[PDB]
Design a protein around this nucleic acid. Structure first.
Ligand code: MG
Ligand code: MG
Ligand code: MG
Ligand code: MG
Ligand code: MG
Ligand code: MG
Ligand code: MG
Ligand code: MG
Ligand code: MG
Ligand code: MG
Ligand code: MG
Ligand code: MG
Ligand code: MG
Ligand code: MG
Ligand code: MG
Ligand code: MG
Ligand code: MG
Ligand code: MG
Ligand code: MG
Ligand code: MG
Ligand code: MG
Ligand code: MG
Ligand code: MG
Ligand code: MG
Ligand code: MG
Ligand code: MG
Ligand code: MG
Ligand code: MG
Ligand code: MG
Ligand code: MG
Ligand code: MG
Ligand code: MG
Ligand code: MG
Ligand code: MG
Ligand code: MG
Ligand code: MG
Ligand code: MG
Ligand code: MG
Ligand code: MG
Ligand code: MG
Ligand code: MG
Ligand code: MG
Ligand code: MG
Ligand code: MG
Ligand code: MG
Ligand code: MG
Ligand code: MG
Ligand code: MG
Ligand code: MG
Ligand code: MG
Ligand code: MG
Lengths: 55, 123
RNA sequence: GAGGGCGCUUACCACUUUGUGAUUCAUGACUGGGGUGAAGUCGUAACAAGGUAACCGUAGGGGAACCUGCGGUUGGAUCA
RNA sequence: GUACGGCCGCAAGGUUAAAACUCAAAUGAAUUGACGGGGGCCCGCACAAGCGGUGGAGCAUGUGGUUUAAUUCGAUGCAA
RNA sequence: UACCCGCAGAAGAAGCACCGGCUAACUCCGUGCCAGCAGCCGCGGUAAUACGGAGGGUGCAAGCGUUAAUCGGAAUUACUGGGCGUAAAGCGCACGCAGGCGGUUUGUUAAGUCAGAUGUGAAAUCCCCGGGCUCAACCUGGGAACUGCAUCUGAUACUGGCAAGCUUGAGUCUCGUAGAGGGGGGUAGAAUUCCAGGUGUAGCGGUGAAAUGCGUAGAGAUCUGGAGGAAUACCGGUGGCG
RNA sequence: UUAGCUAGUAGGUGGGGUAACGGCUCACCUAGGCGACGAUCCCUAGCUGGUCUGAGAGGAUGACCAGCCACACUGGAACUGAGACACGGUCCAGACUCCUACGGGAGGCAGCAGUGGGGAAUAUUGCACAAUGGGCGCAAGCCUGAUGCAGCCAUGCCGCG
């Protein structure tokens, strides 16, 4: 338990990542958003209305 | 609909509650930033919206949006909240006033300055 | 002498005290469900006759949607 | 139609009946489609009836993968 | 002091919000679901009129925006002025007290109602016609209003009260008609299952197929007898009663 | 989702008390009184003229000015007085603050400025009694933070640059 809490303190002390020479690389693709909305009722309906307004 | 029915029991109108209950009908309220952080919006938006758990004077503890680009807010930063909902953030119903008591203005904003507490730049 | 005053005394009463209720605010181990999120696990209940027609009341059962019994409704397809 | 409270009930539960929180909808009817382990009619080497195949083998060829200094790039369901 | 006169010089004096739609006003650059915007819808993932900057423009102006709050728009509590078959909405049904409402004729009363008048409805405020601050704000004269209340006078169609009525509503009585309308007690026939026994023998039963199960301790099948419970084929009907 | 409440309670006779009627109080008698037309209990709240919005009806609202009410640190009480149960009067008790020689005493800005505080937020410790008004006075006149004015703030309206 003391080494666990001291590892928390180790993070608080010198956790910041030293960038250089990756030991291994992981090729994934995520971590922001994977959303297309797929519900082209709104997007095309506003476009519809805007085109009617312009023309 | 029948007039006797109304006489016995009148029209009970819609009672309506405020959607900014912490301000207690006050246009702005001072609060202390308990926590300053960023949170992910809900779908379909995506960002790291800047927000702060703030403890008002009236005792309430709410969560307040930090408008504008870049801020100096930290723990214990005394700020004002003004009400105003952030739709794409669940349970964030107050906007932090810029230029208000700790919250410095937006750095290098040249238009719509007043909503962010930025002075008129001098030539 | 009458009468007054002080004192004393009783009556009413505030502070305060006691006991016991009530009611409301906060809080509480643990717990019941609910909403939201990310969309992960098990199934696939409903939507077509959704592949066992669905639903309503009730009863019982079951990891879970549900399943089955009794009564009801059509807000059920097909009938060439 | 849930909690709490009240009334009722032997019980199951019934009745009265909120609030916080939350979404920008939810709904109803009809319309065009598509879809159906809905229905009807017709057709395709669709099945059936047949013939010979591929999958096994060696080789050619292309591809995936792997390897390399590079194994240039593209095609990558049917429709690479 | 108001106010008036004189001096010099354009001198001392313009910002805020917004420009996707709703909403008046569009382009480039930066950026790439990041940074960020947002009142709703929504923008942002490389040509962004929606983010940040510039140019332009638009609305406002010593203000301009944001926030808070009230009313509106919201006929979205519908008194004016909503709706309930399926969108939320008809109690499961009836009986019925209080309550609301009430067919038709005369007369009375005159409460409701109506006409007038009186007292009042403070002043300010709103509104109207004028006056004064150089105008306006502001001040201010008069009026109207204060939609109300009480008292008196009068009106009598309607509603109300009272008296009398009338039969069209409602109700009774007479004779019939149809009905699975309700309660009670009997009873009949078919069938199921069981029990007993007769014949009889190798399967029965079941499903899409099977197995569990019942059978040689004689099933299943067929016949007779017995017992018991429940529901009433046909009639039987988009027929009846409630 | 507060259904029962009420014993001086409701009434009466008599006595008392008030400036005055009265359960206002007392004795006794009666056994009443309130409540679905919402009694009672809980929450909120000063009321109004008005203000804002609205075509209107309504809805919200009750800052300023004016009428009424209630309160004067909190809880009581009376006294004087035509008038008070009395803001800058009195007595008592309490909390707080102050003085003390420790025995005991003092005070009340919700008057005007002002201070600390709370808050998103709201002004000067100004001039004057010259006008109006008030108290006293035969009168002069005295007093008057009412009031008339000035200061500060774009807080609103209006005007102008
Ligand atoms: Mg759309
Ligand atoms: Mg099912
Ligand atoms: Mg299914
Ligand atoms: Mg199935
Ligand atoms: Mg089914
Ligand atoms: Mg179904
Ligand atoms: Mg079962
Ligand atoms: Mg319940
Ligand atoms: Mg539909
Ligand atoms: Mg089809
Ligand atoms: Mg074939
Ligand atoms: Mg091979
Ligand atoms: Mg081969
Ligand atoms: Mg290749
Ligand atoms: Mg091919
Ligand atoms: Mg702009
Ligand atoms: Mg436009
Ligand atoms: Mg903007
Ligand atoms: Mg992109
Ligand atoms: Mg670009
Ligand atoms: Mg915009
Ligand atoms: Mg309305
Ligand atoms: Mg509104
Ligand atoms: Mg409607
Ligand atoms: Mg429905
Ligand atoms: Mg419905
Ligand atoms: Mg019904
Ligand atoms: Mg009549
Ligand atoms: Mg009359
Ligand atoms: Mg009249
Ligand atoms: Mg008046
Ligand atoms: Mg004039
Ligand atoms: Mg009459
Ligand atoms: Mg007759
Ligand atoms: Mg008496
Ligand atoms: Mg109060
Ligand atoms: Mg209106
Ligand atoms: Mg006192
Ligand atoms: Mg005080
Ligand atoms: Mg005197
Ligand atoms: Mg006296
Ligand atoms: Mg007094
Ligand atoms: Mg004082
Ligand atoms: Mg003061
Ligand atoms: Mg003093
Ligand atoms: Mg101060
Ligand atoms: Mg402060
Ligand atoms: Mg000052
Ligand atoms: Mg004077
Ligand atoms: Mg003096
Ligand atoms: Mg000014």
């Amino acid at each position: 338990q003391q080494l666990a809490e001291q590892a928390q303190n180790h993070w608080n002390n010198h956790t910041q990542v030293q960038r250089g020479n990756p030991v291994r690389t992981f090729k994934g693709t995520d971590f922001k958003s994977t959303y297309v909305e797929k519900s082209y009722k709104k997007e095309r309906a506003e476009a519809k209305r805007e085109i009617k307004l312009v023309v | 609909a029948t007039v006797n029915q109304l006489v016995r029991k009148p029209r009970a109108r819609k009672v309506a509650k405020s959607n900014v209950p912490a301000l207690e009908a006050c246009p702005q309220k001072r609060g202390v930033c308990t926590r300053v952080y960023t949170t992910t919006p809900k779908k379909p938006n995506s960002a790291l919206r800047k927000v702060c758990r703030v403890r008002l004077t009236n005792g309430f503890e709410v969560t307040s949006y930090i408008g504008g680009e870049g801020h100096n807010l930290q723990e214990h930063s005394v700020i004002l909240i003004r009400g105003g909902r952030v739709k794409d953030l669940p349970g964030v119903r107050y906007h932090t006033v810029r230029g208000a008591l700790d919250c410095s203005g937006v750095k290098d904003r040249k238009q719509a300055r007043s909503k962010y507490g930025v002075k008129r730049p001098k030539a």
